[PDB]
Design a protein around this nucleic acid. Sequence first.
RNA 1: CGCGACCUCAGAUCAGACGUGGCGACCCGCUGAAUUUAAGCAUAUUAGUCAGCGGAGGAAAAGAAACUAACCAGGAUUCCCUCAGUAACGGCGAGUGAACAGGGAAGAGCCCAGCGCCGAAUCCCCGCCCCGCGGCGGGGCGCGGGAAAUGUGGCGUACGGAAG
Lengths: 118, 158, 86, 203, 122, 50
Amino acid sequence: KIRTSPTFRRPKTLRLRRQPKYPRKSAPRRNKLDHYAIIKFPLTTESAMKKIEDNNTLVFIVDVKANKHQIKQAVKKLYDIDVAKVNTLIRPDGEKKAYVRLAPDYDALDVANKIGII
Amino acid sequence: APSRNGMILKPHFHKDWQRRVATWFNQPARKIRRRKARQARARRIAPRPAAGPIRPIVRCPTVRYHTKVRAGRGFSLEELRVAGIHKKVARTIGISVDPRRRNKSTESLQANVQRLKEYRSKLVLFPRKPSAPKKGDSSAEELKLATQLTGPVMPIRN
Amino acid sequence: TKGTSSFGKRRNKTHTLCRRCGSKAYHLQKSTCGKCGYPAKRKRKYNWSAKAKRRNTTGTGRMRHLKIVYRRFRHGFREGTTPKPK
Amino acid sequence: GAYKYIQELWRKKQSDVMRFLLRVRCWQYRQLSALHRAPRPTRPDKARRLGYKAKQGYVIYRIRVRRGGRKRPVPKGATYGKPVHHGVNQLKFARSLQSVAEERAGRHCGALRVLNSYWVGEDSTYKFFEVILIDPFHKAIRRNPDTQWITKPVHKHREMRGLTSAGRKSRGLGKGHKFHHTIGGSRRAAWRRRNTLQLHRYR
Amino acid sequence: AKIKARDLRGKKKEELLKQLDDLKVELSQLRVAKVTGGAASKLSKIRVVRKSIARVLTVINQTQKENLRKFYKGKKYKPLDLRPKKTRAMRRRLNKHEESLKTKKQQRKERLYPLRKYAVKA
Amino acid sequence: SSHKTFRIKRFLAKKQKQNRPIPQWIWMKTGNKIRYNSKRRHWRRTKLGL
RNA sequence: CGCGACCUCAGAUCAGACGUGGCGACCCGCUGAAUUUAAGCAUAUUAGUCAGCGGAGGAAAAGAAACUAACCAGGAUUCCCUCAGUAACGGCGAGUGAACAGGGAAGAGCCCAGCGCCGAAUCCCCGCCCCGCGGCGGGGCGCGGGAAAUGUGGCGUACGGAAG
C-alpha cells in the first residue's frame, strides 16, 4: 500500500442488520382503509344519475385518503365489475367524489339497479 | 408627617408584604393532624413510651440559664460506658445517644449514669420471639403488666 | 394617503395556521409561530401574561390521556385483571 | 498504597515533573472538542475520593469551560438604569467555572447523572474539568444498595440545582455565624421566613 | 339475529371474519338505503349494524391479545404493547427486588442490634 | 383564491358545514335553551380569519 | 511487509436500555430591573423583588458540626413562639436588620475514598433447563463472553478502627 490520494477517508466499516430480540409492537396493524371503508355510498343526484345513464359511469362518495388505484380495486371487488378509469375530486363539503367510468362490456344503468339506486 | 408629641416609629411594610402574608386558619387543623399523627405513632409502639427515648439531665449554657436543667439530645458515650451499655444496643432499648456530648464535670456524668441505672431497672424487655423467653429479658408475669408511659419518661424536674 | 387608500394594498398574508397551536400566527418569512414558536422544541409561554397562559393549559383541551390517568389513579393503576365474571 | 503517593504528587503542581504533565495535557485537551468522553479518569486517585468507582455505568466526560469573569450581556454596554447597575465589565458569575462544567456535561448527557468533578488543567483562556457521570439504569448501579440513591427521581440534574459539591459552594450554605443568610433550606428560604407576616388567627 | 359477545368468543378465526363481511355488506347496503331516500325502519338498523361490527372487531382483537400475552408469557422480552403501561415514572422505579436489597454491612446491623419491644414503669 | 392548499380547503370545508341553522326538533328537547344558531357567519360580515 | 497485543479515537437501522416535551401553586439553581421612597437627587430604598432562563418532587431544599458558646457549658437539619424592630447597617438620612441562649413540633441516624488485610473473595450480559412475576426475579448448567489490579467486593471511617 501507498496513499494514492492526499486525503484520509473514513474507511467503509461493516454495518449489520436489525435482528431484534422482540418486535416493538406485538401485532401488525390491521388495514382500516378496506374495500368497505373506502367506498361510503353512491351519489343518487340529478347530475350523477345522468352520469350513469349517459357516460356508463358510477358516482361514489369515497374516503379522502384513497388513490384512484384503491377506488378501482374497491369498485371491482364490491360490485364484481371492471373499471375503465377513475376521475376523483374533493368536494367543497370536504368528502372525495369518484367518477368511476366502467369498461364497455358492463352497463352502468344495469349495475346501478343491482346496488339499488334509482 | 408628625402631628405633635408621638412615638417616632418605622413600619417594615415597604416591600410587597401582601404576597407573603402567612395566615393561621390551618392552626386548629394542624393541631388535629399533629395529635392524630401522635396517637397513631403511640399505637404503633404498643408497649414503648409514647414520648420517645429517655434524654439526659443537661445544664443550659450561658450564665442566664446555668441555674436550670433541660433534656439533652442524648447520653454521652462516657455516660453510657460507666453505666455499661454498648452505644449500638442503647438505641434498641430506647436510650438517646449523641457522641458529640463531652463530660467536663464528674457531677453531670454521675447524675446521667445514675439516670441510666434507674432506666435499666424500670425497663421491662419483651423477648424477640414472644413464645420462648431467653436469658437476657424480663419475666413473663412482668410482661403482662407492661403498658405505655405518657409524657417524657423519667421527667427531668429541677 | 396613509389611511384609507393604503388599506387597499393589503393582499398578501404574513401569518398562516401554526401546526402545534392551530393559531393564525406562523410567520411565513421568519418561519416561527408568534404564539407557540413551532420550530422551537419548547412552548412559547411567558409569566407576564397570566391570561394568555390560562387560554392554552391542561384544562383548555380534552386531556384524552390525562383525564383517564385521574380515573386510573383511584385504583392504584391496576393492570391485566378483570372484574369477577357472572 | 500507591494512591497516597499519587495524592501528594498532585499537591506539588509547581514541581518540574507536574508542570511538564499539566502543560503537555493542557496542550492535548485544547486540540479536542469542548465536551468529549475521556475513556478513564485522568486522575484515577482524585475520582476515588469523589465517589467514582471503576465499574460499568460510571462515565467520565472531560469538558473545558472558557475562562474569565462574566461581562453583562447588554447591547453596547447600555444598562438603562441608575449608576449602581451601570456595571458591565468587572462583573463576576455567582457559580464557579467547575459548576458550569458539571452542568454542560449533565445537560448534554441528559440521561446520565453528574456525581462530582475535578480540575485537570488551566490555560489562560480555558479551565479543563473531568466530570464523573453515573447511569441510573445500568444494573451494576441499579442493584447496588450503596449507589441506588442516584437511581431515584429526586436526583435528576443535581448540577442544574447546585446539589453537586461544586454547585453547593456557590450557595453559601454551611453551619455557624458566617452562614446566617442561608438559614433554612437555602438563601431564598431564609429571605422567605424573614419577609413573611405571621398573622396568627387571635393576635 | 341479535349478535352478543358471548356467542362470538368460542367461535373460530375465519368463522368470525366471515360474519364481519356478512355485516360490512349489510351496512354498505343500508348506507345506499339512506341515500336512495326511504325506509325509516332501515335507517334505525344502520346503528345496530355499526355496533355489531364493533362487537365482532373487539372479540377479534380481544382473542389476538389473549393469545399474544400467552405466547410472550415465559419470555424475558415481550413487545411494548404487552408490557405494563402505568405512569412513565412508575416504570422507571426500582423493581420489587431492587428496593428490597440491603448491603452486607446493614444486614449485620439488623442481626446484631434489632429494635427491641420494651416498656418502662412510671 | 382558486389556487388553494389541501390544508386550507379542509378548513373551509368544516366552516361551510358549521354554517347551517339548527334542526327544528332541537328546541322540542326537554331542557332546550337554544332559540337559533348564534355562531352563524356570513361571508360579507365576518371574514373567518386568514 | 505480515500477524497477536494494547492505547486513543471512529461507523452501524448492531443487542438491550435511557434522556428530551408538558404542568409549574409550592420547591432548587442562576439572572435581575424600574416605577416607588428619600417631599429634588446620584449612594441607599423598592430588591436579590417583578420580568427573563434552567431543574425537580409529592413535598423540595437542608442535615448528623472545619457548630454554638465562654456556661456548672450545650450538641444534625427543618419548623413554631421568643429573642426583636434588638446587636448591627445606613447621603448614621429615608430606611434596613439577623443570630445565640430559652420553650415547644418532630426527632434517626449514617456511608465512602484514604489507610490496610483477605488467591477479584467482586460485578455485568448472552444460551439452556426449572419455578416464575402486567414492579424480569429466583435456582441449576456451561475452558459462554465481558468489565475490573489505571482497584471490584467483605471488614473498616474520627463517636476512633484493625490485627493477634
